[PDB]
């Protein structure tokens, strides 16, 4: 659910989202790393976890619209930075 900007949740949020105490979520996430459903790292003193990879799920005809529009302005970025190269190095090779 979280974006790729942070995806860095805390242990207190799991204590809210799973109503389980603080002294068991570390035992929980070490199981989750062992099975292979998630790939991330665990801090203990700043009480946060750096999740990096999550298991791919399925999605309906609405999340493709998210992959529609997030893909679409990545087209012009490949266009824009290349347009310098065919203009600035044009005489270097015709």
């Amino acid at each position: 659910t979280r974006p790729a900007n942070h995806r860095q949740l805390t242990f207190e949020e799991i204590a809210k989202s799973a109503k389980i105490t603080v002294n068991e979520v570390e035992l929980l996430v070490m199981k989750a790393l062992s099975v292979g459903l998630v790939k991330g790292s665990i801090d203990e003193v700043d009480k946060r976890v750096h999740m990096t990879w999550v298991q791919p799920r399925v999605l309906d005809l609405q999340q493709i619209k998210g992959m529609k529009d997030r893909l679409e302005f990545w087209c012009t970025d490949v266009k824009s930075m290349e347009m310098l190269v065919e203009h600035q190095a044009h005489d270097i090779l015709t």
């Binding site: 999605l59 619209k65 992959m67 290349e82 190269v85 090779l93």
Partner: protein, 286 residues
């Protein structure tokens, strides 16, 4: 199973001339022929080919023909005239992956175990490498059918050889991009390959044409990679990825700053080497 394929430019050319020889049919014909080669060291090699007589009618397009006597005797001649050479599989002219190529491969696998196919180009326009090859894998799995079999692309490149490199470099004699210096990389993959990434961004834009309107099978196994690409989209510019980037610019440019400093002194020593040959001949010669 197979690392990669190696294609010579002869067999690359030895389909085009046959595509000319059947070009007088006008209406429709795909060139399908027998591919010969000798795979060694887990690397697929392709050496020689011909083409077998092959026709196709559009209504009930499951009816193919391979004149196997033409396949028997001419390979028997080719096994005679080159016993190093053998069968390696087959090919077809491959514009758009026609439908009969699901059992053509199964028709003639009783000769080659890994009967590989090769898709070539007759009208060249791309930014990639216009030779494609697949492999035969089968599955009783996933979701689709009890009997399921789909082709998978093993990577492809055009191998050279000391005999034929004499030939092709004599046969080009055309516009060339030799003298690889600071500029060949700028145009082989900095002008070009950035636009090469266009037609792959735009290729997955073409599958995206089914949001509510396109073809009826939806996703299942296409979006696990697309979910990963936005997940494996690289790191943002906040960390020492900012700082260690300025670090190496502050190291790579110092070598350029030394090397350009040398360039000025060398040509200055050349300048005196022309002032030794200017003044010391006008009094001598006149």
């Amino acid at each position: 199973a197979v690392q990669k394929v190696v294609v010579h430019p002869l067999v690359l050319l030895s389909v085009v001339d046959h595509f000319n020889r059947i070009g007088k049919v006008g209406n429709q014909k795909r060139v399908v022929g027998v591919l010969l080669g000798s795979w060694q060291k887990k690397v697929l090699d392709v050496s020689n080919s011909f083409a077998v007589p092959f026709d196709e009618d559009d209504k009930d397009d499951s009816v193919w023909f391979l004149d196997h006597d033409y396949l028997e005797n001419m390979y028997g001649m080719f096994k005679k005239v080159n016993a190093r050479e053998r069968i390696v599989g087959w090919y077809h002219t491959g514009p758009k992956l026609h439908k009969n190529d699901i059992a053509i491969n199964e028709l003639m696998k009783r000769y080659c175990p890994n009967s590989v196919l090769v898709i070539i180009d007759v009208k060249p326009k791309d930014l990639g490498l216009p030779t494609e090859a697949y492999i035969s894998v089968e599955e009783v799995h996933d979701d689709g059918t009890p009997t399921s079999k789909t082709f998978e692309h093993v990577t492809s490149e055009i191998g050279a050889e000391e005999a034929e490199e004499v030939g092709v470099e004599h046969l080009l004699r055309d516009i060339k991009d030799t003298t690889v210096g600071t500029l060949s990389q700028r145009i082989t993959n900095q002008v070009h390959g950035l636009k090469g990434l266009n037609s792959k961004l735009l290729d997955i834009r073409s599958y995206l044409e089914k949001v509510a309107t396109g073809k009826l099978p939806i996703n299942h196994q296409i979006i696990y990679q697309l979910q990963d690409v936005f997940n494996l989209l690289p790191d943002v510019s906040l960390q020492e990825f900012v700082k260690a980037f300025y670090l190496k610019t502050n190291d790579q440019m110092v070598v350029v700053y030394l090397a350009s400093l040398i360039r000025s002194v060398v040509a200055l020593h050349n300048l005196i080497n022309n002032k030794i040959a200017n003044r010391d001949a006008e009094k001598k010669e006149g």
